[PDB]
Amino acid sequence: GNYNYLYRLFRKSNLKPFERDISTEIYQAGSTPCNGVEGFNCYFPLQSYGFQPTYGVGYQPYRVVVLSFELLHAPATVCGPKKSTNLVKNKCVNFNFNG
């Protein structure tokens, strides 16, 4: 059982976009103060996953990479690989050299 992966189970409010929450404070679900001890109505918000190789496809671990593309007023430098057609000489061709 691989318990090295954690997820937040309870929070008072929903997360904002592109927010990371690494707080490990006891979640207060009730009016009573937690006082830092996990008792009644007070739960630790981070819970471990229990990945095993004999699990179903809906419970098996999936690695997710999300790529976010933004354009800002700064010069854009992450560009795609512009392909290069082989050079042909001595003929009337339409040339595009570095824009």
């Binding site: 189970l9 679900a29 229990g50 179903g56 496809v57 419970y59």
Partner: protein, 596 residues
């Protein structure tokens, strides 16, 4: 903030942690079942103790949230399920005594060995040593010896234990705000809070009697026919006017009558529908059997088995070196892990069992979307019933011809249908009076209607009145004849078989009406019908979220268990039995006329 949100967060935490703990416990149990070794036993015991302690701690936390301030039906159902004390309400001494009594009854039943006096050097275990003798012997005194000796040893050991057991269970049940332990068992079918679809604990006994009154003529005709055939087999023991001798029913306790098919066959001259030889000739492996079952389930529109099912299940006997339990069992380990543990042979029985267990797996898969504490059947009847409908559908000659296991030129006449229906009646109809009598007797014992000194005098009186089976010799109060059965000795409910039997034919009629089958009910096959699978999956996906009455409305359109589909299923056989019983006398006498 509010009580409902607090309960919802607590239920989320319970579901998430309980699912992983249940997986660990179930995996330990699986490792014990596929590998019987002492370390696996220790790991299973440790996991079970952790699971029970966790359930106790969660129930203790759960009770602090009052039920009446929660309006959501699902949340209230989960809180009701979790807040049961179980044995925790009882004192620690009495709880420990009850646990010790249950464990020692389990050891006595499992390791009970009985053999003939004057030859005690080796003895036979009931699971194969005596089952084969009870199912295949034709000798009167040998069967009488086995039956009386096993009931003598087991009953004389278990009678004080059962006397303590009834008092302790009644004390726990009255401590849990129930009338008796019977009311505690009947609380499974109790629906509260739904408008119109409420069902009461008191209504179950009345419904069972009402259905059994309609069961009684068909059972009387079947009993008369079986009595006449057993009279042919044994000339002088069986009386024309009396009950059947107890040790001649083909099984150890009278649970099923399916071992009397050879003696009571209507048309022996006609061939059987046995497909064992066809699989042997084509070398059908158990993997092929499960693939054909999967093909059946995808034909009706249900989802196919996962890759983890094929990878992790044990569908063949491991070998001499590794020990495993031979009983077929479907395991819902949790987290989408579904396995079948069966020592599959090349037989028709194993093929039907494979369909039944894969039906159990399909039922388990359907409610995977539900919360953990609601991942069960709506009642105990539905879970077995959805496997039994597959057992009904797979056994048809149309299914065997469709998959190529039967010759396409086999003549399906009325005589083969009559003998097949009689075999299905011996398996299915015969268990109903025994089940009803046993549950009613246990309910009267728990309720206090029968005093401890009068348990057996009433019990045999019930068996003559209901089952139509007479004792070979009278038994006094030193015997404990009910507790020789597996379910009653190990604290299991027995009404699930009765409810399963009625729900089986109700579901069968509903799916056949969905599939637009236009012939007899027993000639119906539910393959190739997407709409029947959709109608089944609508109930299957709910799990325990909805009441069983609403689920039954979803499938058959009725708010209560019904007996008419069973009578419709056996109607050709019912007419044939009525025709054949003109000379003979239908019904039995409760007197000691055959033997006592």
């Amino acid at each position: 903030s509010t009580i409902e949100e607090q309960a919802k967060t607590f239920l989320d935490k319970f579901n998430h942690e309980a699912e992983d703990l249940f997986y660990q416990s179930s995996l330990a149990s699986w490792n014990y079942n596929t590998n019987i070794t002492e370390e696996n036993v220790q790991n299973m015991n440790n996991a079970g103790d952790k699971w029970s302690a966790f359930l106790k701690e969660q129930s203790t936390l759960a009770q602090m949230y009052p039920l009446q301030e929660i309006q959501n039906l699902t949340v209230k159902l989960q809180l009701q399920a979790l807040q049961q004390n179980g044995s925790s309400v009882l004192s620690e001494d009495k709880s420990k005594r009850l646990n010790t009594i249950l464990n020692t009854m389990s050891t006595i039943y499992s390791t009970g060995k009985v053999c003939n006096p004057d030859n005690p050097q080796e003895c036979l275990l009931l699971e194969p040593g005596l089952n084969e003798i009870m199912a295949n012997s034709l000798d009167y005194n040998e069967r009488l010896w086995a039956w009386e000796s096993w009931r003598s040893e087991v009953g004389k050991q278990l009678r004080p234990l059962y006397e303590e057991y009834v008092v302790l269970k009644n004390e726990m049940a009255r401590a849990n705000h129930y009338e008796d332990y019977g009311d505690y068992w009947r609380g499974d079918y109790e629906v509260n809070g739904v408008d119109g679809y409420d069902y009461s604990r008191g209504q179950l006994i009345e419904d069972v009697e009402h259905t059994f009154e309609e069961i009684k003529p068909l059972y009387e005709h079947l009993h008369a026919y079986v009595r006449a055939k057993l009279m042919n087999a044994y000339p002088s023991y069986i009386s024309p006017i009396g009950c059947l001798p107890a040790h001649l029913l083909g099984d150890m306790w009278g649970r099923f009558w399916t071992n009397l098919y050879s003696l009571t066959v209507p048309f022996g001259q006609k061939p059987n529908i046995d497909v064992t030889d066809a699989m042997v000739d084509q070398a059908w492996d158990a993997q092929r059997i499960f693939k054909e079952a999967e093909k059946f389930f995808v034909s009706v529109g249900l989802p196919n088995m996962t890759q983890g099912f094929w990878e992790n299940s044990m569908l063949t006997d491991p070998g001499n070196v590794q020990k495993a339990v031979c009983h077929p069992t479907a395991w819902d380990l949790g987290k989408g892990d579904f396995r079948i543990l069966m020592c599959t042979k090349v037989t028709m029985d194993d093929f039907l069992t494979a369909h039944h267990e894969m039906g159990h797996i399909q039922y388990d898969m359907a409610y995977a979307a539900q919360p953990f504490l609601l991942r069960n059947g709506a009642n105990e009847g539905f879970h077995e019933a959805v496997g039994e409908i597959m057992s009904l559908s797979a056994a048809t000659p149309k299914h065997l011809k469709s998959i190529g296991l039967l010759s396409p030129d086999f003549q399906e006449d009325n005589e083969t249908e009559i003998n097949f229906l009689l075999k299905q009646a011996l398996t299915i109809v015969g268990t109903l009076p025994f089940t009803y009598m046993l549950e009613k007797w246990r309910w009267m014992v728990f309720k206090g209607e029968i005093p401890k000194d009068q348990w057996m005098k009433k019990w045999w009186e019930m068996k003559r009145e209901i089952v139509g089976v007479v004792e070979p010799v009278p038994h006094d109060e030193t015997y404990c004849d009910p507790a020789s059965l597996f379910h009653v000795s190990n604290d299991y409910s027995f009404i699930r078989y009765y409810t399963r039997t009625l729900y089986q034919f109700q579901f069968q009629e509903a799916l056949c009406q969905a599939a637009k089958h236009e012939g007899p009910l027993h000639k119906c096959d539910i393959s190739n019908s997407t709409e029947a699978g959709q109608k089944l999956f609508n109930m299957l996906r709910l799990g325990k979220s909805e009441p069983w009455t609403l689920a039954l409305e979803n499938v058959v359109g009725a708010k209560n268990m019904n007996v008419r589909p069973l009578l419709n299923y056996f109607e050709p056989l019912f007419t044939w039995l009525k025709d054949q019983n003109k000379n003979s006398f239908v019904g039995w006498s409760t007197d000691w006329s055959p033997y006592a």
